[PDB]
Amino acid sequence: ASKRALVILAKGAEEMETVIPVDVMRRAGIKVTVAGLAGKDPVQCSRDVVICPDASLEDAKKEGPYDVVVLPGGNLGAQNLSESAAVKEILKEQENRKGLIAAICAGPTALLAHEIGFGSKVTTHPLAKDKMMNGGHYTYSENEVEKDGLILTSRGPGTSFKFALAIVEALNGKEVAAQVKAPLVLK
Amino acid sequence: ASKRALVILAKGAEEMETVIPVDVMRRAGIKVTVAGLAGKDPVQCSRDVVICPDASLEDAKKEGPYDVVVLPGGNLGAQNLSESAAVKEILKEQENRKGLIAAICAGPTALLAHEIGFGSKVTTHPLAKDKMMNGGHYTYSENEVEKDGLILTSRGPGTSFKFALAIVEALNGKEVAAQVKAPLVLK
Ligand SMILES: [Cl-]
Ligand SMILES: [Cl-]
Prior knowledge:
Chains A, B: Its EC number is 3.1.2.-, 3.5.1.-, 3.5.1.124. Two copies of one chain form a homodimer. Chain A is of the alpha/beta class.
């Protein structure tokens, strides 16, 4: 069966960090569900791009499990993810079943909020480092993409392609990732 | 006054090539209007991301002129742009008033369809070269971004950041482009 990805989309999400992974994962033949944190309604992203989610998170979370749960960044988006009990439950379940969790920019700070993957090497946007490192529960990395087992993190809009291709490689292998990469006109 | 950009959004547009320039231009303090070719309704992009335009093209075209007109790629999106009489009128007017026209991936093939900027050096997605070069009306480039006066072209999803920053540099200058670039985590 095809792999499945849940992308959790909150108000104030960075739209580039949402769309790049969604699009690249779909190019890889992954079934992606863009799930709205607040419900089924369109979501106003950080730079005012408005995206219509495929489903509410309430509905999508009942259609698990997923091979990856993806958390976009954006400062306000990540704060919304961090404050959500539903996100907490989803991430804890994903961690418990040894499934991949991928987060970019400010996204990884939601891992901290929900006590996910402590002891991992992680990266974040430079401006989100202090929040992520509060308490020293992770070890910090400046790599564009960091993968420590099932915790996959990345830095910012500009590292979104590498982040998305890392998810593809983790799920579908190096060859598929290379096949998907070539038509993107990268490197 | 702030610069103004018109981004024309058609069904089958490449969502990455739509969102990256919109977001980066807004980071640069440009007033961007995402205008739906077909009207006010949400637009199903090439990888099924659904974007709600700010306005219909019918309405937005009456609120010109714009400092840049931006054509995203996506094979089917670009075909829709190429077939549109409204797009023809907008591009001809922009060309006539010596305003910037920016197109990426398959997007530049709409310049060919509407007989815009003949004699320019252009680039496109590798797979769109043959369509763009039909008749030899342009000279082809393999640069990630090509700017020949007021015709600014680029290659693919992976060159979208360079494309968007080139638009910012053209409108608001090198220093603003560098300021906007740094937080994106590029290079
Ligand atoms: Cl942000
Ligand atoms: Cl396409």
